[PDB]
Structure 1
Amino acid sequence: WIARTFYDGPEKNYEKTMAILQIEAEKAELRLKELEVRRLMRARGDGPWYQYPTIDKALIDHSPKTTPDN
Protein backbone atom coordinates (compact mmCIF):
# COMPACT_ATOMS: atom_id res chain seq x y z
CA TRP A 1 0.00 0.00 0.00
CA ILE A 2 2.79 2.45 0.87
CA ALA A 3 4.58 1.75 -2.42
CA ARG A 4 1.32 2.04 -4.36
CA THR A 5 0.14 5.36 -2.93
CA PHE A 6 3.43 7.15 -2.18
CA TYR A 7 6.09 6.05 -4.69
CA ASP A 8 6.76 5.13 -8.32
CA GLY A 9 8.76 2.33 -9.93
CA PRO A 10 12.53 2.10 -10.34
CA GLU A 11 12.45 2.84 -14.08
CA LYS A 12 11.23 6.40 -13.54
CA ASN A 13 14.22 7.35 -11.39
CA TYR A 14 16.54 5.32 -13.64
CA GLU A 15 15.56 7.16 -16.82
CA LYS A 16 15.37 10.56 -15.12
CA THR A 17 18.95 9.97 -13.96
CA MET A 18 19.93 9.07 -17.52
CA ALA A 19 18.44 12.32 -18.85
CA ILE A 20 20.09 14.39 -16.10
CA LEU A 21 23.48 12.78 -16.76
CA GLN A 22 23.18 13.44 -20.49
CA ILE A 23 22.38 17.12 -19.88
CA GLU A 24 25.27 17.58 -17.46
CA ALA A 25 27.80 15.82 -19.70
CA GLU A 26 26.76 17.96 -22.66
CA LYS A 27 27.14 21.10 -20.55
CA ALA A 28 30.63 20.09 -19.41
CA GLU A 29 31.74 19.39 -22.98
CA LEU A 30 30.34 22.75 -24.09
CA ARG A 31 32.20 24.57 -21.31
CA LEU A 32 35.52 23.02 -22.32
CA LYS A 33 34.91 23.82 -25.99
CA GLU A 34 34.01 27.42 -25.15
CA LEU A 35 37.22 27.90 -23.17
CA GLU A 36 39.31 26.54 -26.05
CA VAL A 37 37.49 28.69 -28.62
CA ARG A 38 37.99 31.80 -26.47
CA ARG A 39 41.71 31.07 -26.19
CA LEU A 40 42.06 30.64 -29.96
CA MET A 41 40.05 33.77 -30.79
CA ARG A 42 42.02 35.93 -28.35
CA ALA A 43 45.36 34.60 -29.60
CA ARG A 44 44.67 34.90 -33.34
CA GLY A 45 42.08 37.66 -33.80
CA ASP A 46 40.47 35.90 -36.78
CA GLY A 47 37.06 35.33 -35.19
CA PRO A 48 34.01 37.43 -34.34
CA TRP A 49 35.34 37.93 -30.80
CA TYR A 50 38.05 40.27 -29.52
CA GLN A 51 37.73 42.62 -32.50
CA TYR A 52 39.47 45.87 -31.66
CA PRO A 53 38.69 48.96 -33.72
CA THR A 54 40.93 50.33 -36.45
CA ILE A 55 40.62 53.61 -38.34
CA ASP A 56 37.68 53.70 -40.73
CA LYS A 57 38.94 54.06 -44.29
CA ALA A 58 35.87 56.09 -45.28
CA LEU A 59 37.50 59.06 -43.51
CA ILE A 60 40.31 59.34 -46.08
CA ASP A 61 40.02 62.20 -48.58
CA HIS A 62 40.81 61.18 -52.18
CA SER A 63 41.28 64.49 -53.99
CA PRO A 64 44.09 66.51 -55.55
CA LYS A 65 45.97 68.14 -52.69
CA THR A 66 47.56 71.31 -54.15
CA THR A 67 50.73 69.21 -54.46
CA PRO A 68 51.22 66.38 -56.98
CA ASP A 69 52.87 64.00 -54.48
CA ASN A 70 49.97 64.00 -51.98
Structure 2
Amino acid sequence: DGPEKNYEKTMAILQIEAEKAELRLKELEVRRLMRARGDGPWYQYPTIDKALIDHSPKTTPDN
Protein backbone atom coordinates (compact mmCIF):
# COMPACT_ATOMS: atom_id res chain seq x y z
CA ASP A 1 0.00 0.00 0.00
CA GLY A 2 1.09 3.57 -0.59
CA PRO A 3 2.11 6.14 2.00
CA GLU A 4 -1.34 7.64 2.63
CA LYS A 5 -2.35 4.36 4.27
CA ASN A 6 0.45 4.24 6.84
CA TYR A 7 0.62 8.03 7.25
CA GLU A 8 -3.02 8.70 8.16
CA LYS A 9 -3.17 5.41 10.08
CA THR A 10 -0.10 6.30 12.16
CA MET A 11 -1.65 9.70 12.82
CA ALA A 12 -4.62 7.83 14.27
CA ILE A 13 -2.30 5.76 16.46
CA LEU A 14 -0.55 8.85 17.83
CA GLN A 15 -3.68 10.94 18.42
CA ILE A 16 -5.49 8.11 20.22
CA GLU A 17 -2.40 7.30 22.27
CA ALA A 18 -1.81 10.97 23.12
CA GLU A 19 -5.36 11.46 24.39
CA LYS A 20 -4.99 8.22 26.35
CA ALA A 21 -1.66 9.46 27.70
CA GLU A 22 -3.04 12.77 28.98
CA LEU A 23 -6.21 11.19 30.38
CA ARG A 24 -4.01 8.91 32.49
CA LEU A 25 -2.04 11.86 33.86
CA LYS A 26 -5.29 13.65 34.67
CA GLU A 27 -6.65 10.56 36.43
CA LEU A 28 -3.61 10.21 38.68
CA GLU A 29 -3.86 13.82 39.80
CA VAL A 30 -7.68 13.79 39.98
CA ARG A 31 -7.51 10.70 42.20
CA ARG A 32 -4.96 12.49 44.38
CA LEU A 33 -7.09 15.62 44.68
CA MET A 34 -10.18 13.57 45.52
CA ARG A 35 -8.47 11.56 48.27
CA ALA A 36 -6.94 14.68 49.82
CA ARG A 37 -9.93 17.05 49.89
CA GLY A 38 -12.81 14.57 49.86
CA ASP A 39 -15.17 16.82 47.88
CA GLY A 40 -15.73 14.20 45.20
CA PRO A 41 -18.20 11.53 44.10
CA TRP A 42 -15.83 8.65 44.82
CA TYR A 43 -13.38 8.14 47.72
CA GLN A 44 -16.19 8.89 50.19
CA TYR A 45 -16.28 6.75 53.28
CA PRO A 46 -19.37 5.62 55.22
CA THR A 47 -20.81 7.89 57.90
CA ILE A 48 -23.61 7.14 60.34
CA ASP A 49 -27.01 7.95 58.83
CA LYS A 50 -29.33 10.43 60.55
CA ALA A 51 -32.54 8.42 60.15
CA LEU A 52 -31.28 6.01 62.81
CA ILE A 53 -31.53 8.77 65.44
CA ASP A 54 -34.84 9.16 67.27
CA HIS A 55 -36.57 12.51 67.80
CA SER A 56 -39.38 11.26 70.04
CA PRO A 57 -39.60 12.89 73.49
CA LYS A 58 -37.63 11.00 76.12
CA THR A 59 -38.08 10.47 79.85
CA THR A 60 -35.67 13.22 80.84
CA PRO A 61 -36.31 16.76 79.53
CA ASP A 62 -32.73 17.86 78.88
CA ASN A 63 -31.72 15.95 75.76
TM-score by length of 2: 0.96
CA positional deviation for 1:21: 0.4
Aligned-residue offset at 1:64: 1.0
Structure 1 unaligned segments of length 5 or more: list them.
Answer: 1-7
**TM superposition shift of 1:16:** 0.3
Distance (Å, rounded) in 2 between the aligned partners of 1:45 and 1:55: 17
Cα deviation digits, residues 30-69 of structure 1 (max 9, x gap): 0000001000000000001111011000001101111110
With normalisation by structure 1, the TM-score equals 0.87
Stretches of structure 2 that go unaligned for 5 or more consecutive residues are: none
Report how many aligned residue pairs link the two structures. Answer: 63
Q: Distance in 2 between matches of 1:57 and 1:46?
A: 20
| Counterpart-to-counterpart distance in 1, 2:25 and 2:17 | 13
| CA distance in structure 1 between the partners assigned to 2:3 and 2:61 by the alignment | 88
RMSD, aligned α-carbons: 0.6
Q: How does 1:1-70 map to 2 (within 5 A)?
A: 8-70=1-63
Identity of aligned residues (%): 100
